[PDB]
Amino acid sequence: KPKLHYFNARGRMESTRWLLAAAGVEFEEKFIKSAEDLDKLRNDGYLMFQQVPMVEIDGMKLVQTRAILNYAASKYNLYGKDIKERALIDMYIEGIADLGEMILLLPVCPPEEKDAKLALIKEKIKNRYFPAFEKVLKSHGQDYLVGNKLSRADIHLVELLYYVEELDSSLISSFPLLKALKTRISNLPTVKKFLQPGSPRKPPMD
Amino acid sequence: AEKPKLHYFNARGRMESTRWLLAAAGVEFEEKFIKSAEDLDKLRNDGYLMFQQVPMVEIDGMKLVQTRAILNYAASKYNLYGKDIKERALIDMYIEGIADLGEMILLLPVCPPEEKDAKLALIKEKIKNRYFPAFEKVLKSHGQDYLVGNKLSRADIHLVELLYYVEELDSSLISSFPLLKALKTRISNLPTVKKFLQPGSPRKPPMD
């Protein structure tokens, strides 16, 4: 079992909890509860850049969310079939990451910037991100973003739709194919289960 | 096939790490510079930018945007992403560290001036206490000429590019890391990289 080292919170580890659950992959978590939990992982050499997230998997101690995710997507066959399909997947998910990063940092936003930032994010959701993904779905007519087969792109996007719903639930209203993807993916057995009470899935930061 | 075609401003910014990697791989590419708002508008309006932003690279029939998507495709295409899933994990970890420190340096200019003497000092602390020791430690652990798999990878390249910008910031920062110094000279003397560091290459200058 992969072992996820992090605080008991979403943060930078939640996207990995979603990917591993969507792939049927069981895992353990070990939560950092104090400064001395963290200082101990550092002192043991566990953290190449002194930071978590860190995941122990197949003999490695991987840090950096993108390295963790890339490894797991490839290992569990969620990274498409060849380098061209990786490339679409990578392009789609890096856009998802950029939008995610905005939302994820919004609560540490200086209070005097908050109004402006919220408007800018919703304007990007409506005019930049959601149109791009609706287009992809519409261009090929298929249930999945890439190669007609579940990949990390579907997972990461649907994860983000849930965060956008929490932020403002009207934002997705004009994008039926996104809504439809959300529904379809949220009904896969592994994701439906992760979405039910009792899973490793974490609440919003308060 | 088509030479890859890089669409960006005529500056370093977020395309420079792409220039380094292609030039290191011996790959001939063309550049199409964005000079005006109108130029960027036309790329957008043409539907060439999935997310309405550059960098964008035309390669193998795709219009790839997002720096990490571009880099990841080119590294695999030219055997600069390791030989298997485990070596790529190490490469990804190494290069995401590099990108974190690189982003901080990259943005430092557009810091508001009242915060800039404190950013700069924080950057220098992490270089000396976090990043350079992390990479010196990898190099010392294997004794080999390259970071991963005893073979040129994209990690050596992104790392040595960042060594050049760290030098621009403060040439003293590297002085206690003998293996990083050694890496930088060796990689800089690779034929393709020596050429790219010679005048008249696509390598771009600092911004003024």
Swiss-Prot record, chain B:
Residues annotated as binding glutathione = Y8, R44, Q53, V54, Q66, T67
**Molecular function in Gene Ontology:** fatty acid binding; glutathione peroxidase activity; glutathione transferase activity; steroid Delta-isomerase activity
Q: Where does the GST N-terminal domain lie?
A: 2-82
Q: Which SUPFAM superfamilies match?
A: GST C-terminal domain-like, Thioredoxin-like
Q: From the UniProt record, give one GO term of the biological process aspect.
A: epithelial cell differentiation
EC number annotated for this UniProt entry: 2.5.1.18, 1.11.1.-, 5.3.3.-
The alphabetized UniProt keywords are: Acetylation, Cytoplasm, Isomerase, Lipid metabolism, Oxidoreductase, Peroxidase, Transferase
Any Pfam family matching the protein: GST_C
Top-level taxon of the source organism = Eukaryota
Q: Which cysteines are joined by disulfide bonds?
A: none
Its function, per the record, reads: Glutathione S-transferase that catalyzes the nucleophilic attack of the sulfur atom of glutathione on the electrophilic groups of a wide range of exogenous and endogenous compounds. Involved in the formation of glutathione conjugates of both prostaglandin A2 (PGA2) and prostaglandin J2 (PGJ2). It also catalyzes the isomerization of D5-androstene-3,17-dione (AD) into D4-androstene-3,17-dione and may therefore play an important role in hormone biosynthesis.
Descriptive protein name: Glutathione S-transferase A1
The uppermost taxa in this organism's lineage are: Eukaryota, Metazoa, Chordata, Craniata, Vertebrata
Q: Which gene encodes it?
A: GSTA1
